[PDB]
Amino acid sequence: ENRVIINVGGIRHETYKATLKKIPATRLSRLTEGMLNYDPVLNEYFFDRHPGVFAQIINYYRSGKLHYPTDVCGPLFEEELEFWGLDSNQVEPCCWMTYTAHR
C-alpha cells in the first residue's frame, strides 16, 4: 500500500514509497509500473545489482546521509552510486577516510 519492494539481485529490500522520494531525480525516486523490470504478479522491481551494497544505497534515502560501506572498496560502492544516480560528493565527514583512500 505505502511500501515498495525493490528486488535487488534476488534480495527483496522493502521500504515506504515516501522514503524513495526523499532524494529527487534518482533512479529510485523515479520508479514506475510502466518500467519493464516491474512485475505486476509479485508487485516488485528487479534490478541486477549488488544486493549487499544496496542497504547502504537505500540508507541514504532513509537517513538523508551518505555513508560508505567498509566491507567493499570505495570504487565498487561508487559504481553503485553512479547506477542509482546518487552523488558521492555528498559523503559524510565520517566517511572521508574511506572515500579519499582511493584517489
**Residues contributing to the annotated binding site:** 67, 73, 94-95
Give per-residue burial for 40-51: e unless 16+ CB within 10 Å, then b: eeeebbbbebbb
- For position 88 contacting Zn ion by CB under 5 A, the verdict is no
Q: Give the residues across from 6 on adjacent strands.
A: 13, 45
- Beta carbon nearer to a second copy, 2 or 89: 2
Q: Looking only at Cα atoms, what is the longest distance across the chain? A: 45
* Segment interacting with Zn ion, rule: CB under 5 A, options 12-20, 37-45, 56-64, 84-92: 84-92
Q: Stretches 20-28, 39-47, 56-64, 72-80: which one binds Zn ion (CB under 5 A)? A: 72-80
State how far Cα 96 lies from the chain centre.
19
- Which positions touch Zn ion (CB under 5 A)? 67, 73, 75, 92, 94-95
